[PDB]
Amino acid sequence: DKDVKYYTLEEIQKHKDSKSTWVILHHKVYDLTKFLEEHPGGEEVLREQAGGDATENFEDVGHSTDARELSKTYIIGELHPDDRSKIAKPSETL
Ligand code: HEM
Known part of the structure; x- marks a missing residue:
């Protein structure tokens, strides 16, 4: 722990608390907690999904x-290697 900052998908899917908005763009875990307002675009767009692959949105615009x-x-950590090394198809419902 407290080295590489490896977080699992579901773990990151629990990082959307009050003033704790994370996003896993591509395969890297970025903390934008102190960037919500600073972001030249807004906070809501950041807090829209949070804790999950926000690349969809990020790339929708491209940047x-x-x-x-x-x-x-702003990299804090990276997607768990057990997952990243063998990108497992995530579960979904609706
Ligand atoms: C690594 C995290 C991010 C950083 C460092 C970042 C940085 C920036 C910067 C510097 C701009 C200014 C435009 C440019 O120069 O390209 C911008 C604009 C913008 N960003 Fe981000 N961004 C991040 C993540 C996101 C995410 C995930 C979203 C959506 C969920 C988002 C939505 C937008 C939008 C919408 C604008 C333009 C505002 C508008 O015209 O509505 N950004 N961002």
């Missing part, structure tokens, strides 16, 4: 490369 490398500066 500039400036923001891409910025993600790295």
Whole structure:
């Protein structure tokens, strides 16, 4: 623990508390808690999904490369290797 910051999908799916909004863009866990307002776009767009693959939205817009490398500066952790190494098809319902 407290090294690489490896978090599992379901674990990250429990990071949407009050003032704890995480997002796993691509295969990297970014903490945007202190970026909700700072984000030149807003908080709600950040707090829309949270704790999950927000790449869908992120890429829906694409973002500039400036923001891409910025993600790295906001990298807190990464998707658990057990999962990432063998991308398992996530469950869903509706
Ligand atoms: C790594 C995390 C993120 C960073 C560092 C980031 C950074 C930025 C930056 C710098 C811009 C300004 C435009 C540009 O220069 O490209 C921007 C705009 C924007 N971002 Fe993000 N962003 C992040 C995640 C997200 C996510 C996941 C969403 C959606 C769920 C989002 C939605 C938007 C929208 C909508 C705008 C433009 C506002 C508008 O025209 O409505 N961003 N972002």
